[PDB]
Write a protein that binds this ligand. Structure first.
Ligand SMILES: [Zn+2]
Ligand SMILES: [Zn+2]
Length: 51
DNA sequence: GCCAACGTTGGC
DNA sequence: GCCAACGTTGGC
């Protein structure tokens, strides 16, 4: 399998804008990570199978 | 080829 | 167990 996709239906997924104040917003360049308020609740769970 | 952002690792 | 850094890659 490949990388998982956002679920689109949890609160973080339904969020319209980045929060602007978390570690990932402030350091967008070094982290490569989505805003911590936008991270999908499903994707915070570790994979059922590796790649 | 770019870019948003997942997967994995490892330092704490 | 948490979380930042890096390499990566799906979609464009
Ligand atoms: Zn944020
Ligand atoms: Zn979600």
């Amino acid at each position: 399998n490949k990388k998982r996709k956002r679920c689109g239906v949890c609160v973080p997924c339904l969020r319209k804008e980045p929060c602007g104040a978390c570690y990932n917003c402030v350091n967008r360049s070094t982290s490569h990570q989505i805003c911590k308020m936008r991270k999908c609740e499903q994707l915070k769970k570790k994979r059922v199978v590796p790649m």
